Point group: D2
Chain length 286, copies 4
């Protein structure tokens, strides 16, 4: 079972900084991250231009052996274009959010989107389902009807919703994308987790996977609860920007910055976060 | 890890039939059910008069050794009165939904409700959280703050939400109440499940539990999917009435009927259901 | 266009004081309330026993010439009984919430509930739609499908949702149940409003209606915003209980009190609310 | 009180077509539309590149006297840059959706976004509130708190939510953005409506506005109800793409296409929509 990092996109000076990125990718993959999921929500995908996602694809694929590239764009030609680019850079799969933002697109329009994506590449296409962000759900039944989905990341608090894809798509690789379900996802044997904490605490996640494999549910759960406390703190000051600061706190290197409207934490917010997670990081030392 | 049955309330004619009820409890308790949860949502709790919940308490505490009685009422005095009655009948705990229907009660109100329940009895008071029905959530932080909650049934698709109660009340017994999470609940070692399907397929839930305990996570999951397929068909025509028909289908006896506004299935609905589950009743 | 009051249910001691209730009905019908809507949500309907609703039905039809009685119950038989009793005391119509609480209910079961209600009486049956409380919406299309709705009270922030019933049911009386849309509802010419604030500021509602008819939209809107400030303060400490206190504050007499789990405001909350509405009170 | 059109963006073969655009703009503005709201939701704004939004600003300011350009972008530098460009092109105001997509950004991040916009230009900045699409609400109190909002478009079925902006921001021009509230917006005297149907039936909106002003509430309402039946059919089929077909059907010229993932309607869908609306009273 895999630990997939939806890796952060590391800006410095308003532009992407590969190498902050690559040092980061190399760090986390050396600490239990199996797969790198680039241009995910944690990596600000919807906020990146096509060309930024191309740079990220190049940086991820040269820094890691297993890469999935998230390709959604509200211009579908760019999603197709990027899919092909990622495939040519050796990505093992591409993923896409359903068309987001626009309320009540039709089923036919969602279906054409994913079907054009499947036609464009030979590597597997994953559905990246994220109803809270996307404003729509593509559930297991709908994903099966698309007829080409070979993988799912379901960022969903409903573990049943995620398990349902293994039911309808017995051959698909199915992942839960929620940090609060990491323990549970290994326990029910999903194919893996895509968890944002894989950026700052991948060794905690591997700790959990190890515990679950050993049958040590008490340790798994307890490490989960620690992770939850950390997540909770970060949610409090704005989670997308806090991921970067947690990386620095936990991993000890410069992580770059997001870009607005996901503005970087200011120094007050960073000081606060650092204190907030110290209660629970002596409880750590992994 | 326990299988708790939110046992159906078994009307016949239009009135409670306590002997269908007891036959039913005795059967499922011999087929894997560890605790009877009387007057829950599946038992139509909120549609029942105080006297009816009383009669149902007598039947449960007669038919079964472990009974938790669900006492919520939109007259808090009837909740307290039933709690005391439940204890006097030998119930091992009582449980309550939070005050429901009325939007935006204050926290002081909700808290005074639970705290008045705790002070009325010496057996444990369980929170029964069911945001989708109740229209408000009392999460683990809120439950810890109530100060007297000894157990939780959380009917919630969000397993992390259920699991939080173990985080904040590690001494409480915490159960998840969604049928779609039975496998997962056992997998993550909650204290057990309260699942509507304990009425009609208790031995399937004991199977899932057994398989989880072996390590046949793959068997567990596969049993769970069988179970999801059945719940889905029943959801299609009205789950609350359909539970009664599923009991007949799988357990083989008369299950009585719900009471309107939860009207009993009509012949067409039953035939459809019978036919819809026949697909998966064979895969059993 | 009518001002309908969903009158509070006045408890003192733990029990209904129907003299309080009648003095309250008398006072507010003398100040611009046209219809009395008994036992709705503001009246703690779902929290009331059949006997409490019969008592309110008696006192209301005694103190007021136009009474709609809200009858919903999670025992459909009690709803039918109350409807029939309401007819017999001279209610001009009955209303019901759809079956609430239970999430797992079929259209057949909702349709049957209203149709049996329509069969039970000859006076009109209003749908009382209130999705946020009820957990279910019966929209205009669904309401037309029922084939017997003669009126609608739609407690809904979506004014379009409410207007939809006039489109789908042109002969029905359609009322909006939201305090924040009183001004809007008069402006679009719904048949009227059923507004909780009719308990405590019926003359503000009449002032809005006058202003709208005088084409003085700016005064209409400004009275509405004054109302909103008062409602928002009340919402902060627990709206259901605060309504009673607002009656005392603005009407000058003892309104009695709700009943737990809708516990009465405590003295600190009453004091807070009096001071919160004082700014807006002096500006009428 | 104004009729503001959140005007469709007219593509041909997935490329922007300024001539279709300009013809559509000139036509609807001669039939009642007072203001052109460019690159809003009906205009596929979040789907458009910066380049395309600049071309659209150019075409709209060249084809219409009053134009508000919607500038939201998930790269905030682009929103700022487009606000400056729109101002330089003579927009009477810029609007912005709050930052969208990303759940749970901080209030500080949202406030910074809007204030950076306000600082970037001298023309009014409008809040374009659309909780269903955006995933967050910037309500009247929050809007006042921003401290620089001078207009609001509120796409919201809750008319009271929209009227609250008039209470907290008495100088703000406030519009409701929902087609089903055109009649009610005029009746409660909001500053106007930004209704997607102004693309296809501007003269029906003008009619509702005239009926309200003449005290003819029963006509307003039944015109509103005619409109609701049309919108309902379009919704049934994919509203965003249906809008283009409705322009053609109702205004009698070509409207171009949307661009995928908002794919154009197919033949069967267009035929269904035509029948649905011919029947629609």
């Amino acid at each position: 079972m895999e630990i997939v990092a939806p890796v952060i996109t590391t800006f410095r000076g308003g532009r992407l900084d590969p190498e902050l990125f690559a040092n980061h990718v190399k760090n986390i993959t050396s600490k239990g991250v199996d797969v790198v999921f680039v241009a995910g929500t944690t990596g600000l995908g919807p906020a990146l231009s096509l060309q930024e996602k191309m740079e990220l694809t190049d940086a991820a694929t040269s820094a890691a052996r297993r890469v999935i590239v998230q390709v959604a764009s509200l211009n579908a030609d760019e999603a197709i274009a990027l899919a092909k680019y990622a495939e040519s850079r050796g990505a093992e799969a591409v993923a896409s959010l359903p068309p987001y933002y626009f309320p009540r697109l039709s089923e036919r329009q969602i279906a054409k989107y994913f079907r054009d994506l499947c036609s464009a590449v030979s590597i597997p296409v994953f559905l990246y389902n994220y109803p809270a962000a996307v404003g729509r759900d593509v559930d297991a039944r709908a994903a099966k009807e698309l007829g080409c989905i070979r993988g799912v990341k379901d960022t969903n608090e409903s573990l049943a919703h995620t398990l349902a894809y293994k039911r309808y798509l017995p051959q698909a690789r199915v992942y839960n994308g929620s940090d609060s379900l990491v323990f549970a996802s290994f326990a029910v044997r999903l194919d893996g987790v895509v968890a944002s904490s894989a950026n700052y605490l991948p060794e905690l996640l591997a700790g959990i996977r190890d515990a679950v494999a050993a049958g040590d549910i008490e340790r798994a759960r307890s490490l989960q609860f620690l992770l939850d406390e950390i997540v909770e703190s970060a949610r409090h000051i704005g989670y997308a920007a806090a991921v970067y600061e947690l990386v620095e706190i936990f991993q000890g290197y410069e992580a770059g910055e997001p870009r607005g409207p996901v503005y970087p934490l200011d120094p007050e917010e960073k000081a606060w976060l650092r204190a907030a997670v110290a209660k629970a990081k002596s409880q750590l030392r992994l």
